[PDB]
Design a binder for this molecule. Sequence first.
Ligand SMILES: O=C(NO)[C@H](NC(=O)[C@H]1[C@H]2C[C@@H]3C[C@@H](C[C@H]1C3)C2)c1ccc(-c2cc(F)c(F)c(F)c2)cc1
Ligand SMILES: O=C(NO)[C@H](NC(=O)[C@H]1[C@H]2C[C@@H]3C[C@@H](C[C@H]1C3)C2)c1ccc(-c2cc(F)c(F)c(F)c2)cc1
Ligand SMILES: O=C(NO)[C@H](NC(=O)[C@H]1[C@H]2C[C@@H]3C[C@@H](C[C@H]1C3)C2)c1ccc(-c2cc(F)c(F)c(F)c2)cc1
Ligand SMILES: [Zn+2]
Ligand SMILES: [Zn+2]
Ligand SMILES: [Zn+2]
Lengths: 514, 516, 509
Amino acid sequence: ASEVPQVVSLDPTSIPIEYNTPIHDIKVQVYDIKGGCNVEEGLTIFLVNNPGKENGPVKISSKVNDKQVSEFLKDENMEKFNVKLGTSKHFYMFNDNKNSVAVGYVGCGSVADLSEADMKRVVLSLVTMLHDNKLSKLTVVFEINVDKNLFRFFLETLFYEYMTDERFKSTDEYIKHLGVYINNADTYKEEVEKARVYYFGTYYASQLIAAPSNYCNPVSLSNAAVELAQKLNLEYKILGVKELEELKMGAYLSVGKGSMYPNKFIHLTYKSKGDVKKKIALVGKGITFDSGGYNLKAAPGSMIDLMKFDMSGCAAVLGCAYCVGTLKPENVEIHFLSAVCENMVSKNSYRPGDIITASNGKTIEVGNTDAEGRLTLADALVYAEKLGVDYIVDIATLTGAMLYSLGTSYAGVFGNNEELINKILQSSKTSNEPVWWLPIINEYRATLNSKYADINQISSSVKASSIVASLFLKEFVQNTAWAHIDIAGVSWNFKARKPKGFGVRLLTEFVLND
Amino acid sequence: ASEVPQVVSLDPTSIPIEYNTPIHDIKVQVYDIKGGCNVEEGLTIFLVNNPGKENGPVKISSKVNDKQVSEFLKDENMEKFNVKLGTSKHFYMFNDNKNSVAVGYVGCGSVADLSEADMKRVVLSLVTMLHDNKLSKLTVVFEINVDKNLFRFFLETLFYEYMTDERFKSNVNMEYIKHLGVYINNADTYKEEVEKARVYYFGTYYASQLIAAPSNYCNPVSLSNAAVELAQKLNLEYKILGVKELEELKMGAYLSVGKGSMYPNKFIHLTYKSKGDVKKKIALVGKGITFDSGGYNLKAAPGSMIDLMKFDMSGCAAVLGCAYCVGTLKPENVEIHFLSAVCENMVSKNSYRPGDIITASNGKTIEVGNTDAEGRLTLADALVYAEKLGVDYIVDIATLTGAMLYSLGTSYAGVFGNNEELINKILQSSKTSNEPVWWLPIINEYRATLNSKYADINQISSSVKASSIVASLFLKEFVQNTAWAHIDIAGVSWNFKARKPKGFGVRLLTEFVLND
Amino acid sequence: SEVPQVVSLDPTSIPIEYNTPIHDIKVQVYDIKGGCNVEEGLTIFLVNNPENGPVKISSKVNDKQVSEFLKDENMEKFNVKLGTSKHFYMFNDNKNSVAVGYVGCGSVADLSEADMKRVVLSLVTMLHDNKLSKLTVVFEINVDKNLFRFFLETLFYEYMTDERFKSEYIKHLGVYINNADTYKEEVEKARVYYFGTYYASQLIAAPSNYCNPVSLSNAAVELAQKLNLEYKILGVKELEELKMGAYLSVGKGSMYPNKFIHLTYKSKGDVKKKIALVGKGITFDSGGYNLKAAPGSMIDLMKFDMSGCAAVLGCAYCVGTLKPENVEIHFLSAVCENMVSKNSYRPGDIITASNGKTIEVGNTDAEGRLTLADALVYAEKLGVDYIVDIATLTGAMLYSLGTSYAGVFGNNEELINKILQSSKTSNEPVWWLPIINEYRATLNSKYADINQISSSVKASSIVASLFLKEFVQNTAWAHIDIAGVSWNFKARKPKGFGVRLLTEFVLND
Ligand SMILES: O=C(NO)[C@H](NC(=O)[C@H]1[C@H]2C[C@@H]3C[C@@H](C[C@H]1C3)C2)c1ccc(-c2cc(F)c(F)c(F)c2)cc1
Ligand SMILES: O=C(NO)[C@H](NC(=O)[C@H]1[C@H]2C[C@@H]3C[C@@H](C[C@H]1C3)C2)c1ccc(-c2cc(F)c(F)c(F)c2)cc1
Ligand SMILES: O=C(NO)[C@H](NC(=O)[C@H]1[C@H]2C[C@@H]3C[C@@H](C[C@H]1C3)C2)c1ccc(-c2cc(F)c(F)c(F)c2)cc1
Ligand SMILES: [Zn+2]
Ligand SMILES: [Zn+2]
Ligand SMILES: [Zn+2]
């Protein structure tokens, strides 16, 4: 526990965090469709498609244990509506006990199996039916086929989108029950609490990312990490400047020199109770605010006002810690690392041109102070390898170029080991968090040859910034399977103006399958 | 009717126009709300507020002639929803006769007076519902207060927003209603607003069709042809002036702009004259640049949005849209001239150049400092021509300066003038048309920056950044002794959010003509 | 067709060299087993050391003079750092003046194509600086047959110098290598691949006033007749009848009429695979009214916007020369020029592709995908199994893959894998990038059926891919974006990237 420094007494000294969310009070009940659906209080929504027929008619296939509601939902009545992806309708009628009931459907399109992108659109339509309607219960009937992972993804996304983050509201009700009808209900029931765990890890990462830099700063973010570890029973260590100096983490320390906040290195650990068969280090980039430094983000479109999100990597990692500490995987040991700091303009800031020494002795010539993430990661990666692990995986909002390469939907993965990269890709598939393998092209290595230092921070000629950054990071892992997940493009949801909490599920699937 | 030149045979030779729209098929009935509501058919939507209570619950007061819908509308059920402006819900159910109806509402907030802006939000929320509706009838129940002019705005806005422009497409989820029912206090006073709204709608939709039509469809030849066709449908006098006539009139400023285009300049002159005695002569002048590249001052800078510059003939579109309304409604005692010097501003071996000195048809020489200030050049000759007609009032409408975006923005247009009475009359038309306009000064202190070293006058200023004022000072120099006002709609003409035209100006100009 | 001129001094053809000094080089491969003979010219040893360690030459040299020079103690003074070279003049046993030296091949045992390029360059440097009758190269390293072929191709290509616009070479090449007999058939394959690549380079390097739509399609014709390939040049009257409104719009502003190029190779005998190769052919890209005016848009490079076409024609030369079996190939290119005029198409214009789809033009500098849409409609009407297009399409490739790797997108995994397999055996490196369907919605025009560009999504190369995907209804299709990879910025010349890639793809299938 460290005291957060303030300039005035109105400066915040902690990150407000909501642990007990309304979502956590929702009772979930799954039923097999074979038994028929009961339509009573609340809203009962059918998820319906029509394979191959673009805007085909709605047909309700499930038995509804009610004569009135069954009559209403007959084919002749439904044929006037179509299944176009994301279309929806509210129905109102009285049931057999002369009570009023609300029914409806969401269109799931014409394709037999939904992509995670489509499912997200289905959820968004559903969440629209929940908003602006004081409901006590929602009931969802699956007339579409989903695999278990996508069933879980449906739940996680539902919980995440429905939830509203109101921590910073001053002057400006959720359902209590969720029923789900699906074929083979027993096979899906185990997905429900996993979805709840995954939702909050995701949502937790999002609260830290969305928290502005005056609230979420290196000291308060590491304070939150400690607090998280205590609630979860993880081991933790927070390295302050004095310890970091002794470890000679020159790269990391140089970046934070300019900040009124002292750097804090977060190290959480989860150990299994049984024999440890696999050791892992997860490393998240943790710049709580990235002004660019003396290479100030002043150019049009540099979006300096978004740079609270430059610790999204760290948040994904802490979010993953929540899931792993909760679900408690066996036969594994996990280190959660983040070299947290803040990149500022000051009389004490490191300068463009400065030559700095990393913790492994490699000297680095700084060409651009706005390329700070790779400096902090270099020391975090050296530290990580000294732990003696089997895999190192870093996750980071490293390069703007990711927006020109893969866009806002897929993250990019780089690495030095093919078996590790495929495992990341397998996690991508099962978490439904899209990731694409990109090359580390060695031909570009020579532009990192500094005239004076051992290595250039940046390339003066090569414009493929994501690859060059990966080449730089590679120099700081000597002998361990390593992968890099650049999330600079997928971290923020620009349409909805909120974080995605991207990566938490991806990392946790990786830990679990292993 | 002139022939449209083509580069290849696949180039279009006319602007497609929809004259008959499904809006024109909708039967409109207005009923008095004190009698309660019939809801046995179609879609019934209640417009409701909750004064004082921000985001307050929905309460429906009206008696309805169906027990089922009555139950649905009980306070216990309706209070699960709130009246946040724009928020809507609607449900399908079976009525007393076991027929399918739909019932819902649109929230109108917590304030008893709806702004025009607020009303557009309500209308948009309604239209969203209609775009997923296949029911034959829409019934709108006003449990809020509205006035005759606000109600007519609701109708015009509803019609325009409801109609979609599919001319360049090669729903399956909606269908256009055939009946629209309105329940409102004092139905009989509001009835006459209906066909007026239908007229104002089409004039506005017609302008929008011209504006949205891309510059390979909408060029000076095709636009002048369209105007001729319109004039013939309305029995208007018309004449289109070509290059040789324009040269004889010595329109050097306007002809300079068009030099670099493959399309010959065409000057549009339509006339409406009332059957009775003529007491007021008015000239309506619309800027008609069918595409604005900037010329040699090419629109290359960040934010110059060259891909939207098909809209630089928006002023032309509003004056032709006004001609529809006028020719249809036929006001008495007035003679109105609809003017536009139409051309295209391009980059060619033949284009005029930055620095060129040119001579306007009133003899004034002009030093061109920026070829992208070409609108004021075409207007200069159009203003001279209009003053020659011997009118009492000249009003120009034009997408003239980008600086409107920084002064009034996208909601309010700006009016400048040389005559207070005419300006006051414009501001009144703005009020009753619900097309907002704000009076800005012509500050004479800036005039000296237009003193060219070589020519009679400068086109632009080299110092003053208050563009909109400077361009007005330039225009003023081409109206000698007539009451004149200038409406700058550059900020206001396009609807960025909805990616379509507003057709701004049609109703404003028509109201000015009808109520003066 | 007659090339139009503004002034009498305007050129009316592309100068093309067919018979090059390279084709006059006698190439001979020997097995290292029976020692190496150092009798004339320059002898170069390719050596490594499995880090910047010392040069140790292992092969036996049948000359007392050269052997004492290559003695381990002398050579230790030199290191094997990749790309470094030394070479000394000396007199051999019979008082002949000979030159002996080495090129270091680093410390890793398996060289990438990138390292191999570095070996070849340092080797070519010496050839340029020395009047030699004969180069001998000794391989004391391990290479694939593919990598061996790559060595030659690169050697020839970099050795050759293009002096067509200006106002000596070895006559013999000796190669000593382990298992000589397995590498002998790679020699003339390499010679062919060299010229396919050098030919494409000549067209790319040719400035726009020499290489315009008329003169470029004239050259394709001249190439077709020399190889006896079926050919067909479609002109404006035909393109209009075919209703290619997107492609015709791009060229409306040019003084050179559009020319659509169609060449065909058919193997003698049973044909099992039909293929359409489509190259982007914009002979100069000014950008149109969306003028390349912004810093770093590099308008002076934009003669290179025809690299995809050149790639395809270079491939036609290789396929026309090697005559693979079981295949029918259609080499397509909608050639035109993108210019600023009174006749130019405008941003905001709505135009109609030959399949009926209307397109809203958001940016005239995205002209490539417009011409490609109409080419792809045309290609699919040919009834082929695969459509592969190659294009300098989006500048974003620079920021995703850079100047070394091209990106490939497509609608069929089996075809994409074939392209990737050809990438590895041609040693022209390509990387698979996704077509992300979630971005499709930003091509939903308010007025037309589809947008040419996105106003929101910044993943240009993918959006462009999504756009092209709409013009292939039912055929396996891939798209190779070579914008970042086409021009060699350090050598200030073209790479002619894609010729060998497309040919291996044809050959391996
Ligand atoms: O500062 C950064 N990481 O710590 C990173 N900057 C870079 O990639 C720049 C920096 C470092 C490099 C050398 C040069 C060009 C490139 C690579 C300056 C970066 C990260 C995200 C973004 C970014 C900007 C946005 F507007 C945006 F919407 C977004 F999602 C990401 C831009 C730059
Ligand atoms: O080109 C024009 N009229 O033909 C007009 N140009 C200007 O106002 C500029 C031109 C002409 C001037 C000298 C200098 C500054 C000012 C005045 C360049 C103008 C009008 C509208 C817009 C404009 C741009 C937008 F991106 C936009 F969204 C909009 F609604 C309007 C930009 C420039
Ligand atoms: O002109 C082009 N295709 O015909 C292409 N332009 C783009 O990708 C831009 C164009 C077209 C688009 C709309 C907007 C942003 C994007 C997409 C302008 C493009 C292609 C190559 C390059 C390019 C520029 C360089 F300086 C360079 F060295 C290079 F290798 C390629 C730049 C733009
Ligand atoms: Zn940075
Ligand atoms: Zn202009
Ligand atoms: Zn271009």
